[PDB]
Design a protein around this ligand. Sequence first.
Ligand SMILES: OC[C@H]1O[C@H](O[C@H]2[C@H](O)[C@@H](O)[C@@H](O[C@H]3[C@H](O)[C@@H](O)[C@@H](O[C@H]4[C@H](O)[C@@H](O)[C@@H](O)O[C@@H]4CO)O[C@@H]3CO)O[C@@H]2CO)[C@H](O)[C@@H](O)[C@@H]1O
Ligand SMILES: [Ca+2]
Ligand SMILES: [Ca+2]
Ligand code: NA
Ligand code: NA
Length: 481
Amino acid sequence: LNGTLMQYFEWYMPNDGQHWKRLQNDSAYLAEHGITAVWIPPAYKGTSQDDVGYGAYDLYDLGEFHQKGTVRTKYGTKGELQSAINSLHSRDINVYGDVVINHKGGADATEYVTAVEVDPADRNRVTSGEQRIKAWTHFQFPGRGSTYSDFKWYWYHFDGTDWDESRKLNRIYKFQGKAWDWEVSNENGNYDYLMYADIDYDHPDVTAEIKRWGTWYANELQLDGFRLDAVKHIKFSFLRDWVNHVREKTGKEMFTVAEYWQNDLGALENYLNKTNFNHSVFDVPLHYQFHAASTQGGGYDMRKLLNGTVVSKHPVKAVTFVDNHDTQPGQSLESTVQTWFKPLAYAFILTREAGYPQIFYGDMYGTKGASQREIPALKHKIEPILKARKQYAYGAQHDYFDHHNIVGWTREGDSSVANSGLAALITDGPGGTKRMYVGRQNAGETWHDITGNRSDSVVINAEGWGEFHVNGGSVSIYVQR
Ligand SMILES: OC[C@H]1O[C@H](O[C@H]2[C@H](O)[C@@H](O)[C@@H](O[C@H]3[C@H](O)[C@@H](O)[C@@H](O[C@H]4[C@H](O)[C@@H](O)[C@@H](O)O[C@@H]4CO)O[C@@H]3CO)O[C@@H]2CO)[C@H](O)[C@@H](O)[C@@H]1O
Ligand SMILES: [Ca+2]
Ligand SMILES: [Ca+2]
Ligand code: NA
Ligand code: NA
């Protein structure tokens, strides 16, 4: 099984309401290129129509109720999403729903709340006496009413907020009688607080409600799994329990991957430990290695790609990726893998045996930000690498990370996939050649570069070795003609 995830959105897509229809219409294309799952953007009403989805106003409004100036979300209506999902399912493409449960944004009304300021660099330090603020904490859901859920939110379901509406002041406010949740990331002392109204996962009605919404959401969209947002800001034991709860209620596997944003393998290992390895994480350290290689012009030691990553230590729990909606140009975690290196990074995640790779909408189709640093559409460069995964990346792997610039790996093929087997080379510097073992069972075959970057044929010798070539700053992936 070479499962391939696709993140089916980018930050700057137009707010025209056609995204679910686009997905529906792309399902044939996705299936043909070996995509077996899609992570869809948050499907519920944000703070406005053009919310990318992380505002999280109303978790039960999937583009169904007239709230925040619109019925549809940015992406379309509930029915359009459901039509896209049934089209994806008709081609055996799993659908992972984005789960934004750190906070709620865009409350319907303010409440007077007693609060103290905390230090934004050290949220365990209180920096004021008690003061009365007006906080956006009251959620009534006037367009929805009680349809699907009569749960209403008030200040006492939250630990704090970043805005006092009476003084018009952006500070971090912790509400009276509240405490930041733990365990969370210990950056800035305690990183429970991120944005909007921060949900209090010490509150038992909150833990109950978010669990039952989880089950509701899975049922409503027939989800096959989840993508968990911003998990370093959400009580770890709660996330663990939430994942088990929805699995228990649905009776489905519910593959789950969490976005724990830290370039630190040890912090990710800690998160995995505290959630009992019941779900995966995005391989954030690998992303940063790709970013670094792509900006150092050949000076990066390409041997380092094998160490310090989630996929190197916990391959079963790694979702590997090149870029996402936070790392793309202009976004809050900007660390974009430069255009020239991006196909090499894709070869790395797509054709190697370890990890569950994810391709980025923004990489395939380009990003539509207002800058001139936008990622170009690289679909045509990635397609042959996807085909390499789908048809050729099977069987025993041999690594050649034995050079500062030119590194490679082979796959011997497997008898259960006809003509499978590949030989990949990437280089962040000058090109050249590497002899690599592809398996004696491929002796005498004529192999060629599926990317078309190199036009030479390589005949595998009797001992199972081929002499493979790669251009400067390029990738070649040889497979049987
Ligand atoms: O309809 C399409 C397919 O849907 C189903 O496949 C699912 C699996 O059920 C999910 O569990 C998941 O598979 C992941 C797996 O969870 C994850 O751990 C990872 O495993 C890799 C591992 O990273 C790697 O190091 C190496 O050991 O190989 C493992 C897999 O061979 O990646 C898996 C996907 O490659 O998602 C898929 C859908 O993408 C269903 O069971 C299939 O029958 C169906 O075709
Ligand atoms: Ca939080
Ligand atoms: Ca709390
Ligand atoms: Na909290
Ligand atoms: Na190098």
